[PDB]
Coordinates of C-alpha atoms and ligand atoms in Angstrom, one line a residue:
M1 CA 9.1 14.0 10.8
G2 CA 5.6 12.3 11.5
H3 CA 5.9 9.9 8.3
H4 CA 4.9 6.3 7.9
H5 CA 8.2 4.6 8.7
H6 CA 9.0 3.5 4.9
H7 CA 12.6 4.3 2.6
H8 CA 13.7 7.2 4.2
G9 CA 17.3 8.0 3.8
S10 CA 19.6 11.1 2.6
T11 CA 19.9 10.0 -1.0
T12 CA 16.1 8.8 -1.1
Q13 CA 14.3 12.2 0.3
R14 CA 17.0 14.7 -1.3
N15 CA 16.2 12.9 -5.2
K16 CA 12.7 12.8 -3.9
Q17 CA 12.6 16.3 -3.4
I18 CA 14.4 17.0 -6.5
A19 CA 12.1 15.0 -8.3
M20 CA 9.2 16.6 -6.3
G21 CA 10.3 20.1 -7.1
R22 CA 10.7 19.2 -11.2
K23 CA 7.2 17.8 -11.4
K24 CA 6.1 21.1 -9.6
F25 CA 7.5 23.4 -12.0
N26 CA 6.2 21.6 -14.9
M27 CA 2.7 22.4 -13.7
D28 CA 3.4 25.4 -12.7
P29 CA 6.7 27.2 -13.2
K30 CA 5.9 29.9 -10.0
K31 CA 5.0 27.1 -7.3
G32 CA 7.9 24.4 -8.4
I33 CA 10.3 27.3 -8.1
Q34 CA 8.9 28.0 -4.7
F35 CA 9.2 24.5 -3.4
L36 CA 12.9 24.3 -4.2
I37 CA 13.8 27.1 -2.4
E38 CA 11.9 26.3 0.6
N39 CA 13.2 22.9 0.1
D40 CA 16.9 24.2 0.2
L41 CA 17.5 23.1 -3.5
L42 CA 17.4 26.8 -5.0
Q43 CA 18.6 30.2 -3.5
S44 CA 15.9 33.2 -3.8
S45 CA 18.2 35.3 -5.8
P46 CA 16.9 36.3 -9.9
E47 CA 20.6 35.1 -10.9
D48 CA 20.3 31.8 -9.1
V49 CA 16.8 31.5 -10.7
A50 CA 18.3 31.7 -14.0
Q51 CA 21.0 29.6 -13.5
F52 CA 18.6 26.8 -12.9
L53 CA 16.4 28.0 -15.6
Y54 CA 18.9 27.3 -17.9
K55 CA 20.8 24.4 -17.0
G56 CA 17.1 23.1 -17.4
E57 CA 17.6 19.8 -16.3
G58 CA 14.2 17.7 -16.5
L59 CA 12.5 21.0 -17.2
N60 CA 9.9 21.4 -20.2
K61 CA 11.0 24.4 -22.3
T62 CA 7.7 25.8 -23.1
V63 CA 7.3 26.7 -19.4
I64 CA 10.5 27.8 -19.1
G65 CA 9.4 30.3 -21.9
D66 CA 6.1 31.2 -20.3
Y67 CA 7.8 32.2 -16.8
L68 CA 10.7 34.2 -18.5
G69 CA 8.0 35.8 -20.6
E70 CA 6.1 37.4 -17.4
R71 CA 6.0 40.9 -17.0
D72 CA 6.5 40.6 -13.1
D73 CA 9.6 42.0 -11.3
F74 CA 11.4 39.4 -10.6
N75 CA 10.7 37.6 -13.8
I76 CA 12.1 40.7 -15.9
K77 CA 15.4 40.2 -13.3
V78 CA 15.3 36.4 -14.0
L79 CA 15.1 37.1 -17.9
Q80 CA 18.1 39.5 -17.7
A81 CA 20.1 36.9 -15.7
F82 CA 19.3 34.3 -18.3
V83 CA 20.3 36.4 -21.3
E84 CA 23.8 36.6 -20.1
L85 CA 24.3 33.1 -19.2
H86 CA 24.2 33.1 -23.0
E87 CA 27.6 33.4 -24.9
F88 CA 26.9 35.3 -28.0
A89 CA 30.6 36.7 -28.6
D90 CA 31.7 35.8 -31.9
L91 CA 29.0 34.4 -33.2
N92 CA 27.0 35.9 -36.5
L93 CA 23.2 36.5 -35.8
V94 CA 21.5 32.9 -37.0
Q95 CA 24.3 30.8 -34.8
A96 CA 23.3 33.3 -31.8
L97 CA 19.6 32.8 -32.3
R98 CA 20.2 28.7 -32.8
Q99 CA 21.6 28.9 -29.0
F100 CA 19.3 31.0 -27.7
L101 CA 16.2 29.0 -29.2
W102 CA 17.8 25.6 -27.6
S103 CA 17.2 27.0 -24.2
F104 CA 13.4 27.8 -24.1
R105 CA 10.4 27.5 -26.2
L106 CA 9.0 30.9 -27.6
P107 CA 5.4 31.8 -25.7
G108 CA 2.3 32.4 -28.1
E109 CA 1.7 36.4 -26.7
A110 CA 2.8 38.8 -28.7
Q111 CA 4.2 40.8 -25.3
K112 CA 6.3 38.2 -23.9
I113 CA 7.8 37.3 -27.5
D114 CA 8.8 41.3 -27.7
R115 CA 10.3 41.1 -23.9
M116 CA 12.2 38.1 -24.6
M117 CA 13.4 39.1 -28.3
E118 CA 14.3 42.4 -27.0
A119 CA 16.3 41.2 -24.4
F120 CA 18.1 38.7 -26.6
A121 CA 18.9 41.5 -29.3
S122 CA 20.1 43.8 -26.2
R123 CA 22.6 40.5 -25.3
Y124 CA 23.9 40.2 -28.8
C125 CA 24.5 43.5 -29.4
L126 CA 26.5 44.0 -26.1
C127 CA 28.5 41.0 -26.9
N128 CA 29.1 41.9 -30.9
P129 CA 29.4 45.8 -30.7
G130 CA 29.2 47.8 -33.9
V131 CA 27.6 44.9 -35.9
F132 CA 24.1 46.5 -36.1
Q133 CA 23.7 50.2 -35.7
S134 CA 20.8 49.4 -33.1
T135 CA 19.1 47.3 -30.8
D136 CA 16.4 47.6 -33.3
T137 CA 17.9 46.6 -36.4
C138 CA 18.9 43.6 -34.5
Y139 CA 15.5 42.6 -33.3
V140 CA 14.3 43.1 -36.7
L141 CA 16.8 41.0 -38.5
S142 CA 16.0 38.1 -35.9
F143 CA 12.8 38.2 -37.1
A144 CA 13.6 38.6 -41.0
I145 CA 15.8 35.1 -40.4
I146 CA 12.7 33.9 -38.2
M147 CA 10.5 34.4 -41.1
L148 CA 13.4 33.1 -43.8
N149 CA 13.4 29.9 -41.8
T150 CA 9.3 29.7 -42.2
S151 CA 9.4 30.5 -45.7
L152 CA 12.2 27.9 -46.6
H153 CA 11.0 25.2 -44.5
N154 CA 7.5 25.0 -44.2
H155 CA 6.1 23.5 -47.3
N156 CA 2.8 25.5 -47.1
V157 CA 5.1 28.1 -48.3
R158 CA 5.0 27.9 -52.3
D159 CA 7.8 30.5 -53.4
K160 CA 11.0 30.0 -51.5
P161 CA 13.1 33.0 -51.6
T162 CA 16.7 33.3 -53.1
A163 CA 19.7 34.6 -51.2
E164 CA 19.0 37.9 -53.1
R165 CA 15.5 38.3 -52.5
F166 CA 16.3 37.9 -49.0
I167 CA 19.5 40.7 -49.4
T168 CA 17.0 43.0 -50.9
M169 CA 14.1 42.4 -48.4
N170 CA 16.5 44.1 -45.7
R171 CA 17.5 47.2 -47.3
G172 CA 17.4 50.0 -45.3
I173 CA 17.4 47.7 -42.2
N174 CA 20.7 49.3 -40.7
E175 CA 19.2 52.6 -39.6
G176 CA 18.6 53.6 -42.6
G177 CA 21.5 52.0 -44.3
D178 CA 22.4 48.2 -46.1
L179 CA 24.0 45.5 -44.0
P180 CA 26.8 43.9 -45.2
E181 CA 25.8 41.6 -48.6
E182 CA 27.8 38.8 -47.4
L183 CA 26.7 39.0 -43.7
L184 CA 22.9 38.8 -45.0
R185 CA 24.1 36.0 -47.4
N186 CA 25.9 33.9 -44.5
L187 CA 22.5 34.6 -42.8
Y188 CA 20.7 33.2 -45.5
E189 CA 22.8 30.4 -46.4
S190 CA 23.4 29.1 -42.8
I191 CA 18.9 28.9 -42.5
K192 CA 18.8 27.3 -46.0
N193 CA 21.2 24.4 -45.3
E194 CA 20.0 24.0 -41.3
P195 CA 16.5 24.6 -40.3
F196 CA 16.4 26.3 -36.6
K197 CA 16.3 22.9 -34.6
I198 CA 13.6 23.5 -32.0
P199 CA 13.2 21.6 -28.5
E200 CA 10.4 19.6 -28.5
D201 CA 7.8 19.6 -25.2
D202 CA 7.0 15.8 -24.6
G203 CA 5.9 14.5 -21.2
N204 CA 4.3 17.8 -19.8
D205 CA 1.6 15.7 -19.4
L206 CA 2.9 13.1 -17.6
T207 CA -0.4 11.3 -17.7
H208 CA -3.0 11.9 -20.4
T209 CA -5.8 9.9 -18.3
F210 CA -7.6 13.5 -17.8
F211 CA -8.0 14.5 -21.3
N212 CA -11.4 15.8 -22.4
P213 CA -13.4 14.8 -19.1
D214 CA -16.9 15.0 -18.1
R215 CA -16.7 18.0 -16.0
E216 CA -14.0 19.4 -14.0
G217 CA -13.9 22.2 -11.1
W218 CA -12.9 23.3 -7.5
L219 CA -14.4 21.9 -4.7
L220 CA -14.0 21.6 -0.8
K221 CA -13.9 18.0 0.5
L222 CA -13.8 16.6 3.9
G223 CA -11.5 13.9 5.0
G224 CA -12.1 10.4 5.9
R225 CA -11.0 9.4 9.4
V226 CA -9.8 12.9 10.0
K227 CA -12.5 15.3 9.5
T228 CA -10.5 18.4 7.5
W229 CA -11.9 20.3 4.6
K230 CA -9.4 20.6 1.7
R231 CA -10.1 22.5 -1.8
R232 CA -9.2 20.3 -4.4
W233 CA -9.5 20.5 -7.9
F234 CA -11.5 17.5 -9.2
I235 CA -12.0 15.9 -12.8
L236 CA -14.9 13.2 -13.6
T237 CA -14.0 11.2 -16.4
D238 CA -14.3 7.4 -17.8
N239 CA -16.8 6.5 -14.4
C240 CA -13.9 8.0 -12.0
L241 CA -13.9 11.0 -9.7
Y242 CA -10.6 12.3 -9.4
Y243 CA -8.8 15.1 -7.2
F244 CA -6.0 17.2 -7.2
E245 CA -4.3 19.8 -4.6
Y246 CA -3.4 22.0 -7.6
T247 CA -4.4 22.1 -11.3
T248 CA -1.0 22.3 -12.3
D249 CA -0.3 18.8 -10.4
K250 CA 0.4 16.1 -13.2
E251 CA -1.0 13.4 -10.8
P252 CA -3.8 12.7 -8.6
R253 CA -4.3 13.3 -5.0
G254 CA -7.0 11.0 -4.7
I255 CA -9.0 8.4 -6.8
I256 CA -12.8 7.1 -6.5
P257 CA -13.7 4.5 -9.1
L258 CA -17.8 5.2 -9.4
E259 CA -18.8 2.0 -8.4
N260 CA -22.7 1.5 -7.1
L261 CA -22.4 4.6 -5.5
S262 CA -25.4 7.3 -5.0
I263 CA -25.6 11.0 -4.5
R264 CA -27.6 12.9 -1.7
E265 CA -27.9 16.7 -0.8
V266 CA -27.1 17.3 2.4
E267 CA -27.3 20.5 4.8
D268 CA -23.9 21.4 6.4
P269 CA -23.8 23.9 9.5
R270 CA -20.4 25.7 7.9
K271 CA -20.2 24.6 4.3
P272 CA -22.7 25.7 1.4
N273 CA -23.9 23.2 -1.1
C274 CA -23.2 20.1 0.2
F275 CA -23.7 16.3 -1.6
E276 CA -22.5 13.2 -0.5
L277 CA -21.1 10.2 -2.3
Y278 CA -22.3 7.0 -0.7
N279 CA -23.0 3.2 -1.2
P280 CA -27.0 2.9 -0.5
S281 CA -26.9 -0.5 -0.2
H282 CA -24.0 -1.1 2.1
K283 CA -24.7 1.4 4.8
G284 CA -21.3 2.0 7.1
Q285 CA -19.3 0.0 5.0
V286 CA -15.9 2.0 3.2
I287 CA -15.9 3.1 -0.1
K288 CA -12.8 2.0 -2.4
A289 CA -10.7 5.0 -3.2
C290 CA -7.1 5.6 -3.1
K291 CA -5.1 8.6 -2.0
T292 CA -1.5 9.6 -2.0
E293 CA 0.6 9.9 1.0
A294 CA 3.4 12.3 1.7
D295 CA 6.1 9.9 -0.5
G296 CA 3.7 9.3 -3.3
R297 CA 2.5 5.7 -2.0
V298 CA -1.1 5.1 -3.3
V299 CA -2.9 3.7 -0.1
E300 CA -6.9 2.7 0.6
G301 CA -9.0 5.7 1.4
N302 CA -11.3 5.1 4.5
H303 CA -14.3 7.2 3.6
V304 CA -17.6 5.7 4.5
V305 CA -19.1 9.0 2.7
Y306 CA -17.6 11.5 0.7
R307 CA -19.0 14.8 1.8
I308 CA -18.5 17.9 -0.6
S309 CA -19.4 21.5 -0.8
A310 CA -19.8 23.3 -4.3
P311 CA -18.6 27.1 -4.5
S312 CA -22.5 27.6 -6.0
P313 CA -25.7 26.0 -6.0
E314 CA -25.6 25.9 -10.0
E315 CA -21.9 24.5 -9.7
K316 CA -23.4 21.7 -7.0
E317 CA -26.4 20.9 -9.4
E318 CA -23.8 20.7 -12.4
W319 CA -21.7 18.5 -10.2
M320 CA -24.6 16.1 -9.1
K321 CA -26.1 15.6 -12.5
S322 CA -22.5 14.8 -14.0
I323 CA -21.6 12.3 -11.3
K324 CA -24.7 10.4 -11.3
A325 CA -24.3 10.1 -15.1
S326 CA -21.0 8.8 -14.3
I327 CA -21.7 5.9 -12.2
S328 CA -21.3 2.5 -13.2
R329 CA -23.9 0.6 -11.9
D330 CA -23.5 -3.3 -12.2
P331 CA -24.7 -6.0 -9.5
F332 CA -20.8 -7.3 -9.8
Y333 CA -19.5 -4.8 -7.2
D334 CA -22.7 -5.5 -4.8
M335 CA -21.9 -9.3 -5.7
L336 CA -18.0 -8.3 -4.1
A337 CA -19.2 -6.5 -1.4
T338 CA -21.4 -9.2 -0.2
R339 CA -19.1 -12.2 -0.7
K340 CA -16.3 -10.0 1.1
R341 CA -18.0 -9.3 4.1
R342 CA -19.2 -12.9 4.6
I343 CA -15.9 -14.6 5.2
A344 CA -14.8 -11.1 6.8
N345 CA -12.6 -11.8 9.9
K346 CA -12.4 -9.5 12.2
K347 CA -9.8 -11.1 14.1
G348 CA -7.3 -10.8 10.9
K349 CA -6.2 -7.5 12.4
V350 CA -5.3 -8.6 16.3
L351 CA -3.7 -11.4 14.6
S352 CA -1.5 -9.4 12.1
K353 CA -0.6 -7.0 14.6
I354 CA 0.4 -9.9 16.7
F355 CA 2.0 -12.2 14.5
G356 CA 3.2 -8.7 13.2
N357 CA 3.6 -10.5 10.3
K358 CA 5.1 -9.0 7.2
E359 CA 3.9 -8.6 4.0
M360 CA 4.4 -7.6 0.3
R361 CA 3.0 -5.1 -1.8
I362 CA 2.2 -6.2 -5.3
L363 CA 1.4 -4.6 -8.5
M364 CA -0.9 -6.5 -11.0
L365 CA -0.9 -5.1 -14.3
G366 CA -1.6 -6.3 -17.9
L367 CA -3.7 -5.6 -20.6
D368 CA -7.4 -5.3 -20.6
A369 CA -9.3 -8.8 -20.3
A370 CA -5.9 -10.6 -19.5
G371 CA -7.6 -12.3 -16.1
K372 CA -6.0 -9.7 -13.5
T373 CA -9.6 -9.0 -11.4
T374 CA -10.9 -13.0 -12.2
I375 CA -6.9 -13.9 -10.4
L376 CA -7.8 -11.6 -7.4
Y377 CA -10.9 -13.2 -6.7
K378 CA -10.3 -16.1 -7.0
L379 CA -7.3 -16.0 -4.7
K380 CA -9.7 -13.5 -2.1
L381 CA -12.8 -15.0 -2.1
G382 CA -11.8 -19.0 -3.2
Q383 CA -14.1 -18.9 -6.3
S384 CA -14.2 -17.9 -9.8
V385 CA -16.4 -14.6 -10.2
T386 CA -18.0 -13.5 -13.9
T387 CA -16.0 -9.9 -13.8
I388 CA -16.8 -6.7 -15.9
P389 CA -13.8 -4.5 -16.7
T390 CA -12.3 -2.4 -14.1
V391 CA -12.7 1.2 -14.7
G392 CA -10.0 2.3 -12.0
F393 CA -8.5 -0.4 -9.7
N394 CA -9.5 -3.4 -7.1
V395 CA -7.5 -4.0 -4.1
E396 CA -7.6 -6.7 -1.7
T397 CA -5.1 -8.3 1.0
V398 CA -4.5 -12.1 0.6
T399 CA -2.9 -14.0 3.4
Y400 CA -1.2 -17.2 1.7
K401 CA 1.7 -19.4 3.6
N402 CA 1.9 -16.9 6.4
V403 CA 2.5 -14.2 4.0
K404 CA 0.5 -10.8 3.8
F405 CA 0.0 -10.2 0.2
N406 CA -1.8 -6.3 -0.8
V407 CA -2.4 -6.8 -4.4
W408 CA -3.3 -3.9 -6.5
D409 CA -5.3 -4.6 -9.5
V410 CA -5.4 -1.7 -12.0
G411 CA -7.5 -1.4 -14.7
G412 CA -5.7 -2.5 -18.4
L413 CA -8.1 -0.6 -20.6
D414 CA -6.2 1.6 -23.1
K415 CA -7.5 5.0 -21.9
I416 CA -6.1 4.1 -18.0
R417 CA -2.8 3.0 -19.1
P418 CA -0.9 6.4 -18.8
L419 CA -2.1 6.2 -14.9
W420 CA -0.4 2.7 -14.6
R421 CA 3.1 4.7 -13.2
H422 CA 1.0 6.0 -10.4
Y423 CA 0.8 3.0 -8.6
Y424 CA 4.4 1.9 -8.9
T425 CA 5.7 3.5 -5.5
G426 CA 6.3 1.3 -2.9
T427 CA 5.8 -2.2 -5.2
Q428 CA 7.8 -5.3 -4.2
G429 CA 6.4 -8.0 -6.9
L430 CA 4.8 -6.7 -10.2
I431 CA 2.5 -9.4 -11.3
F432 CA 1.8 -9.4 -15.1
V433 CA -1.1 -11.5 -16.2
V434 CA -1.2 -12.0 -20.1
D435 CA -4.0 -13.6 -22.1
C436 CA -1.8 -16.7 -23.8
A437 CA -4.9 -17.3 -26.5
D438 CA -4.5 -13.2 -27.9
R439 CA -1.6 -13.4 -30.3
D440 CA -3.3 -10.4 -31.9
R441 CA -2.2 -8.4 -28.8
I442 CA 1.1 -10.3 -27.2
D443 CA 3.4 -7.6 -29.1
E444 CA 1.5 -5.1 -27.4
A445 CA 1.7 -6.6 -23.7
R446 CA 5.6 -7.0 -24.5
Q447 CA 6.2 -3.6 -25.1
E448 CA 3.6 -2.7 -22.2
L449 CA 5.7 -5.1 -19.3
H450 CA 9.0 -3.2 -20.7
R451 CA 7.9 -0.1 -20.2
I452 CA 6.9 -0.8 -16.8
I453 CA 10.1 -2.8 -15.7
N454 CA 12.1 -0.2 -16.9
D455 CA 10.9 2.6 -14.7
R456 CA 13.3 3.6 -11.8
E457 CA 10.3 2.6 -9.8
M458 CA 10.1 -0.7 -10.7
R459 CA 13.9 -1.5 -11.1
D460 CA 13.7 -3.8 -7.5
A461 CA 10.5 -5.2 -8.1
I462 CA 10.7 -9.1 -9.1
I463 CA 8.5 -10.0 -11.6
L464 CA 5.3 -12.6 -11.8
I465 CA 4.0 -13.3 -15.6
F466 CA 0.8 -15.0 -14.9
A467 CA 0.6 -17.1 -18.4
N468 CA -3.0 -17.0 -18.2
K469 CA -6.0 -19.0 -20.3
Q470 CA -4.2 -22.2 -20.5
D471 CA -7.4 -23.8 -20.6
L472 CA -8.0 -22.1 -24.3
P473 CA -7.3 -24.5 -27.3
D474 CA -3.9 -23.4 -29.0
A475 CA -3.0 -21.2 -26.2
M476 CA 0.5 -19.7 -26.0
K477 CA 2.6 -22.0 -23.7
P478 CA 5.2 -20.6 -21.0
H479 CA 8.3 -21.0 -22.9
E480 CA 6.2 -19.1 -25.9
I481 CA 5.4 -16.5 -23.8
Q482 CA 8.9 -16.5 -22.6
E483 CA 10.2 -15.6 -26.0
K484 CA 7.2 -13.2 -27.0
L485 CA 7.2 -11.2 -24.1
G486 CA 11.4 -10.8 -24.5
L487 CA 12.1 -12.0 -21.5
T488 CA 15.3 -14.2 -22.3
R489 CA 17.3 -11.0 -23.0
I490 CA 16.7 -9.6 -19.3
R491 CA 19.4 -11.5 -17.4
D492 CA 20.0 -8.9 -14.8
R493 CA 16.2 -9.2 -12.9
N494 CA 14.1 -12.1 -11.3
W495 CA 11.0 -13.2 -13.4
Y496 CA 9.3 -16.4 -13.7
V497 CA 6.4 -17.3 -16.4
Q498 CA 3.5 -19.3 -14.5
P499 CA 1.2 -21.1 -16.5
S500 CA -2.4 -20.2 -15.2
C501 CA -6.6 -20.9 -15.8
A502 CA -7.8 -18.1 -13.5
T503 CA -11.3 -19.8 -14.2
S504 CA -10.2 -22.8 -12.4
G505 CA -7.5 -21.5 -10.0
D506 CA -4.8 -23.8 -12.2
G507 CA -1.1 -22.1 -11.2
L508 CA -2.5 -19.3 -9.0
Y509 CA -1.2 -20.9 -5.8
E510 CA 2.2 -21.8 -7.6
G511 CA 2.6 -18.2 -8.6
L512 CA 2.3 -16.7 -4.9
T513 CA 4.7 -19.7 -3.8
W514 CA 7.3 -18.5 -6.2
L515 CA 6.8 -14.5 -5.1
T516 CA 7.4 -15.9 -1.6
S517 CA 10.3 -17.8 -2.6
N518 CA 12.1 -15.1 -4.8
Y519 CA 10.9 -11.7 -2.6
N520 CA 14.1 -10.3 -0.8
Ligands
GTP1 N1 -11.0 -18.8 -20.8 C1 -10.2 -18.4 -19.9 N2 -10.9 -17.2 -19.7 C2 -10.5 -16.3 -18.5 C3 -9.5 -16.9 -17.8 N3 -9.2 -15.6 -16.8 C4 -10.1 -15.0 -17.0 N4 -11.1 -14.9 -18.2 C5 -11.9 -14.3 -18.6 O1 -11.6 -13.1 -19.5 C6 -12.7 -12.4 -19.2 C7 -12.0 -10.9 -18.5 O2 -10.8 -11.3 -17.5 P1 -10.8 -9.9 -15.9 O3 -10.4 -11.2 -14.8 O4 -12.0 -9.3 -16.2 O5 -9.8 -9.4 -16.8 P2 -9.0 -7.8 -16.2 O6 -7.3 -8.4 -16.6 O7 -9.2 -7.7 -14.8 O8 -9.4 -7.0 -17.4 P3 -9.5 -5.6 -17.1 O9 -10.9 -5.2 -16.0 O10 -10.3 -4.5 -17.9 O11 -8.1 -4.8 -16.7 C8 -13.0 -12.8 -18.4 O12 -15.1 -12.8 -19.0 C9 -12.9 -13.6 -17.9 O13 -13.8 -14.8 -16.9 C10 -8.8 -18.2 -18.0 O14 -7.9 -18.5 -17.2 N5 -9.6 -18.7 -19.0
4IP2 O1 -4.7 17.0 5.4 P1 -5.2 16.4 7.0 O2 -5.5 17.5 7.7 O3 -4.0 16.1 7.4 O4 -6.3 15.4 6.8 C1 -6.2 14.5 5.5 C2 -6.9 15.4 4.5 O5 -8.6 15.5 5.0 C3 -6.9 14.3 3.5 O6 -7.5 14.7 2.1 P2 -6.6 15.0 0.6 O7 -6.4 13.4 0.3 O8 -7.4 15.5 -0.4 O9 -5.3 15.8 1.3 C4 -7.7 12.8 3.9 O10 -7.5 12.1 2.8 P3 -8.7 11.4 1.5 O11 -8.6 11.9 0.4 O12 -8.9 10.0 1.7 O13 -10.1 12.7 2.1 C5 -7.3 12.1 5.1 O14 -8.4 11.2 5.8 P4 -8.1 9.9 6.5 O15 -6.5 9.3 5.9 O16 -8.9 9.3 6.2 O17 -7.5 10.1 8.0 C6 -6.8 13.4 5.9 O18 -6.4 12.6 7.2
MG3 MG1 -10.4 -6.1 -14.2

């Protein structure tokens, strides 16, 4: 295999591939289908692909429609097999349309709609011979039914057709003659009683972190320790530089918080239009970043610089200008680096491998301003620092009473929260930090907490709540926090509410003691 050795077993790996295949499909249907075929989870025939789409388990129905509408020879065959899996016999045209329109969402392009509705009409007529004199009749009536659905049910259409209007509107449609009055009336009445129920695509953008970015585009980037070049889709937004393998990916490959970095033009012997991201104040020091490993676990980057090649000098200039404008500049970052380096223990590596100490991966989440970063550095540096809001994440490893805690502190601002799920994989303990003086946002904190702990990737995590800011007047006590966060209901999980004051340190060691005592 050649992987780091973590969760490895049949059910684990197979379910992961299944989930990976679906995620890929929803970003790019051709690529998801190819992944599943390569991973022996799907057979390559049009009929097999059709069955996969027809079941559509965890598949975006708009994406299904996009794929089925394509002009490709393979896609045309998939479409025909897809319509063949629908049984329209002994159903009227509205009932058949209800069924078909549950299975996918119609694409926007006229030629794609036409291909799909021709395939539907042909199938309907084969299933119900003699009802319509031609496929054309069936196709046109299908759109008369769709237009009726709009006219009756969209408030923007003022004049609602009567049954008699619908009947007469369709005169001559049956290859020059009229369809049965009672058939048209039945169709009208069905639509009038119940609009078409349409599946609604929610969740495609898994995140919504990258919406309306400062800049995006393809670049080539050089690796950290292993100096290999990779083509990556970059998105610059909210003081972070993200990169992805494919534009269809819904999770980043890498995240680079733009904290006190600079940009320089460089010459490269093989790649054109190159620049580097680097830290001018700490030459040779690792740039804070994270990247995703094969199993989805986020890990720290190893870069001292990021060398990047743009496809033209124009795009190079654009990217440099944009990145420079998006750098978060603040003494805070230099303060952290300097203090960390002072108490940086070289021996720690030779002792960590020898004690062979086991450790504990921690994800620390909570609303913005809760106290997360203050807690992190109180633990890491033994001192209370003056923080600024965290645009991406901070990550530190803290040794406490023979346990090494690898602590991921993720920014809690609104815009960042859809990205929290990115950091779940591998989490052994959740620290959820709450501002106990903030009664205005306690219900919001409750909502966020339960979304986290109900996630499939977080089911096994023990839960430490830091009921923070106990120093403040009228701050909610641990028993109130227990109630307000709805923890009392949860009797099947291991959780604890630890009162804390991050700025004095009160309660922090107690919380770490609880984690060690309860981690199994
Ligand atoms: N009074 C009081 N203030 C605190 C306490 N802990 C943290 N703070 C302050 O609350 C503010 C926000 O704390 P941070 O540690 O930056 O909060 P955060 O959770 O990291 O916020 P994000 O980076 O946006 O996710 C800072 O001014 C801290 O000094 C505390 O225990 N008592
Ligand atoms: O793909 P191969 O040739 O194995 O080499 C990888 C890629 O260059 C990675 O880039 P990407 O993450 O874009 O796939 C890079 O991670 P970075 O993203 O941190 O550059 C790794 O850096 P190191 O882990 O530092 O060696 C490097 O080992
Ligand atoms: Mg913070």
